[PDB]
Amino acid sequence: HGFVQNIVIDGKNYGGYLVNQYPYMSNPPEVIAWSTTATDLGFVDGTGYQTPDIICHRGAKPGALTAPVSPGGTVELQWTPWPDSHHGPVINYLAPCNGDCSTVDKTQLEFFKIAESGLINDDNPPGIWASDNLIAANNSWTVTIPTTIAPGNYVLRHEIIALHSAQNQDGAQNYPQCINLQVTGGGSDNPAGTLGTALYHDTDPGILINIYQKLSSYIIPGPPLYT
Ligand SMILES: [Cu+2]
């Protein structure tokens, strides 16, 4: 359980959508992060993979603001403290807004995967995962925006999938957090995207899985990494 509370880009902080404050206040600030209704600090499990909730989390609406990113620049997402027990991959996607991200129809966003990290070491099951790397970095993840993609406005969909309960159907816990970015530079690729509701299924080999056994490999879920 947790959420993204801060985003560092080009030497400044952009405040995140504080889901344990803003849903209660009257009334909340504009930020680059999408609003959600996930005030339980919770997740979208397999029962919601083919619903709009999986796109940018439960009841999500676009952030009002968009943060520019230098060409090939980094975006550092800072989470509330992530539980060690909540082992799993950390995955990053971009979807073009083809306009102002603040007015997009989230159900039409076509995401392409720009980074993925999964099972790092399995010397001691359930092992060390991307989420553990995130914890070790003081609850932080650094995403590098590709220099090869068409500049424009994009939604970054940043996500941890916790697998500690994934042995049973619909047991995996997805924690997507979306923010709005302005990608800059001289790239030209428009990578093939995937609708949010088509990213995952509750029987994927990296979703329906027993992480407590010895694993020789791990298939990170979602569409192929863009390279
Ligand atoms: Cu949790």
With helix as H, strand as E and coil as C, how does 116-139 read?
EECEEECCCCCCEEHHHHHHHCCC
The number of C-alpha atoms within 13 Å of 187 and in the hemisphere containing its C-beta is 18
How far is residue 134 from each of residues 22, 78, 104, 183, 187, measured CA to CA in Å? Answer: 25, 9, 30, 24, 29
Verify cis geometry, omega within 30 degrees of 0, for the bond prior to 27: yes
Which experimental technique did the depositors report for determining this structure? X-ray
Buried b (16+ CB within 10 A) or exposed e, 192-201: ebbbbeebbe
Cβ neighbours for 100, distance < 8 A, ≥ 6 positions apart: 66, 153
Closest-CA residue to 128 (of 76, 163, 180, 77): 163
Distance 164 CA to ligand 1 centre (A): 9
Element (H, E) at 56: helix 53-56
**H helix count then E strand count, the chain:** 2, 13
Element (H, E) at 55: helix 53-56
DSSP 29: P
Distance 83 CA to ligand 1 centre (A): 7
Joined tokens for residue 56: 């940018």
Distance 46 CA to ligand 1 centre (A): 15
Cβ neighbours for 194, distance < 8 A, ≥ 6 positions apart: 110, 111, 112, 222, 223
Q: 74 and 48 in contact (C-beta within 8 Å)?
A: no
Distance 62 CA to ligand 1 centre (A): 24
Cα angle for residues 179, 184, 185 (degrees, 5° grid): 150
Joined tokens for residue 93: 């996607």
Closest-CA residue to 163 (of 198, 112, 215): 215
Task: Determine the Cα–Cα distance for residues 63 and 106; give it in Å rounded to an integer.
Answer: 11
CATH number at residue 119: 2.70.50.70
Distance 21 CA to ligand 1 centre (A): 18
Q: Which long-range contacts (CB under 8 A, 24 or more apart) does 130-136 make?
A: 130/88, 130/89, 130/90, 130/160, 131/82, 131/86, 131/87, 131/88, 131/89, 131/90, 131/160, 131/162, 132/84, 132/87, 133/90, 134/79, 134/82, 134/90, 134/160, 135/81, 135/82, 135/84
**Number of structural domains the chain divides into:** 1
Distance 155 CA to ligand 1 centre (A): 24
DSSP 54: H
Task: Determine the Cα–Cα distance for residues 49 and 215; give it in Å rounded to an integer.
Answer: 25
At residue 177, the 3 state secondary structure works out as strand
Distance 2 CA to ligand 1 centre (A): 7
The residue assigned the tokens 């298939």 is: 219
Joined tokens for residue 49: 């993979």
Distance 52 CA to ligand 1 centre (A): 21
Closest-CA residue to 146 (of 178, 116, 185): 185
First to last CA, the chain: 31
Dihedral sign (CA 98, 29, 179, 199): negative
**What are the two backbone dihedrals, phi and then psi, of residue 47, each rounded to the nearest 5 degrees?**
-65, -15
**What are the two backbone dihedrals, phi and then psi, of residue 143, each rounded to the nearest 5 degrees?**
-110, 135
Dihedral sign (CA 105, 194, 7, 17): positive
Domain that holds residue 48: 2-227
Distance 85 CA to ligand 1 centre (A): 9
